[PDB]
Design an enzyme around this catalytic site. Structure first.
Site, PDB file in Angstrom:
ATOM      1  N   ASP A 156      39.968  44.928  31.424  1.00 34.70           N
ATOM      2  CA  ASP A 156      40.902  43.972  32.015  1.00 34.70           C
ATOM      3  C   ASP A 156      41.886  43.430  30.967  1.00 34.70           C
ATOM      4  OD1 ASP A 156      40.069  44.140  34.660  1.00 34.70           O
ATOM      5  OD2 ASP A 156      38.532  42.587  34.422  1.00 34.70           O
ATOM      6  N   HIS A 184      33.058  39.221  33.504  1.00 25.36           N
ATOM      7  CA  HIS A 184      33.814  40.458  33.355  1.00 25.36           C
ATOM      8  C   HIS A 184      34.521  40.836  34.650  1.00 25.36           C
ATOM      9  CE1 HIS A 184      30.394  42.051  35.481  1.00 25.36           C
ATOM     10  NE2 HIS A 184      30.876  43.282  35.454  1.00 25.36           N
TER      11      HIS A 184
END
Lengths: 328, 328
Positions: A156, A184
């Protein structure tokens, strides 16, 4: 002197993409590697085939290969552990069903690391749920400190760099100071308020509604988007995310995103007791340091409460289905 | 100045493994690349997802991305073409069925290269049947010389290096002068009579029955062996084979294996008119040269007649189902 690097779930797509990069020498430069490969018995036949491919690559950088289903053999003497393998979320599965299955996997591997791996090992948890899984492993390893542990939020992170690169029409080398906060996934915080581009700050060049709305929501859903298009897991990008996360983790760094055990300092009022993603610098000795003095707006802060709430809630469920007490 | 590199069948396993290596900068070092990606309409959705992954990798080395199903857009201005895509052999399919379908694909791409690609382009054919496919493409491109063309035999080449490395217990950096002769499969000649290991010659260290029997037969069947274990194509090793084949092809080299259009010199009495694999050196200007003065035993020579016979026979079938005349 060759470095022992472990990849769990090695015959899967992510592990398969990562083995050959590490073996080529992408992670440790000119240092020879002894690649450790772990698979469950269902995967040992495929793992063997992967190992055949590795020979067929003829990498001089590869000093040796340990491939196995036995965890004592897999985890012995390793300096780096890519905990990729895990129990995948299936249909009709609760989160507590997910946490139960992964709990057993990572309590075993957490202790495997503790007994067999080097005391100085670096563990990057990739398998979902990374943060909570990493917390299970950590809690099973009494000898290991918390500098040994990290869950991956680098994908990400790079998804932000890549997306901002393309928006400004610049090469990704010229986007700096992005970060993911917290868990996450589900509640990860795409923070673009410290970001720069080669040099004006991204923040006062793109709209607040965009960066902290459409942009943020694209980051959050990027993983699924890729899957929907390819019909497969984001294999190469993830393997790249993990490799570079550990790359910086080993040799230093603007800053990067790492889900680490919250320091005793508890930066930004993030309560200790979870594996939380921070904007971090890393020293050349491989020492991780949380970027501590930043200006967080009401969006970022509210997003931090949302993600910490999820981490604390998820770890409470892990203890619940693991039948754990206070002293555990 | 960035280099335009084309990969056909880009969303497939081989292409997918190769895109990210090239994009990282593995093929052209510090030179930026403009990655060209081609897929058939069935693959455009997956290709798009692959392209999403590429952004998520955040490679500074990537100057740009052309991804398409249109061949004029895919082949325009490229310096390197990895012809990976092809029509896969299915059940109930003759070789002439295979050659018919691939003939149409590669006559189109051969002319696509001719019209749209640079005159100085380097074409590596990977899709089966590589040698004969490469001959179809070459015969469709009237402007291009035969220095533009190559079919891949580097995988079986590295499979030899890797296998000999492990036999002698040495790192693959210390096995030299192996080569594959002839067709890329079925009749490829694993030649280990010039090979050395760090330094005694492999030939007078291992038995003749082994090297030219069991060893040879292992090389010939390695591709299928891997597939049987993994349940999938030898993706990473092949992508590595092709990348390094072109690597040496661009920047030079003991010697390597390359299936090239037989030179007018016709080394070793190998008749011109097929794409034949030779032990070749490559100059720093990227000029390929066949290693011409070697001692071939009765095994090697008999194996050369077997593989040339197959190449000439296969090309005769290609002309047959392509409805071609003498002047074609």
């Amino acid at each position: 002197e060759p470095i022992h690097i472990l990849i769990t779930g090695a015959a899967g797509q992510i592990g398969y993409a990562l083995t050959f990069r590490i073996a080529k020498g992408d992670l440790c430069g000119d240092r020879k590697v002894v690649l450790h490969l772990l698979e469950i018995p269902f995967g040992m036949k495929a793992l063997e085939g992967c190992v055949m491919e590795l020979q067929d690559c003829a990498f001089p950088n590869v000093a040796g290969i340990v491939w196995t289903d036995k965890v004592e053999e897999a985890f012995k003497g390793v300096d780096v552990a890519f905990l990729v393998g895990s129990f995948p979320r299936k249909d009709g599965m609760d989160r507590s069903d997910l946490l139960a299955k992964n709990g057993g996997i990572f309590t075993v591997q957490g202790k495997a690391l503790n007994d067999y791996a080097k005391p100085t090992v670096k563990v990057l948890v990739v398998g979902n749920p990374a943060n909570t899984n990493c917390l299970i492993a950590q809690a099973s390893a009494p000898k290991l400190q918390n500098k040994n542990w990290c869950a991956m939020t680098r994908l990400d992170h790079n998804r932000m760099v890549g997306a901002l690169a393309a928006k400004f029409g610049v090469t990704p080398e010229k986007i700096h100071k992005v970060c993911i906060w917290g868990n996450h996934s589900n509640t990860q915080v795409p923070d673009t308020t410290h970001a720069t581009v080669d040099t004006v700050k991204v923040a006062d060049k793109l709209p607040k509604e965009y960066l902290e709305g459409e942009f943020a929501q694209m980051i959050a859903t990027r993983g699924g988007a890729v899957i929907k298009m390819r019909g497969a897991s984001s294999a190469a990008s993830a393997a790249n995310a993990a490799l570079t996360c550990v790359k910086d983790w080993l040799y230093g760094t603007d800053f990067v995103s790492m889900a680490i055990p919250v320091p005793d300092n508890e930066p930004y009022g993030i309560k200790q007791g979870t594996i939380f993603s921070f904007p971090v610098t890393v020293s050349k000795d491989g020492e991780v340091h949380v970027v501590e003095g930043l200006e967080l707006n009401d969006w970022v802060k509210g997003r931090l409460e949302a993600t910490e709430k999820e981490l604390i809630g998820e770890k409470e469920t892990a203890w619940k289905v693991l039948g754990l007490l206070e002293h555990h």
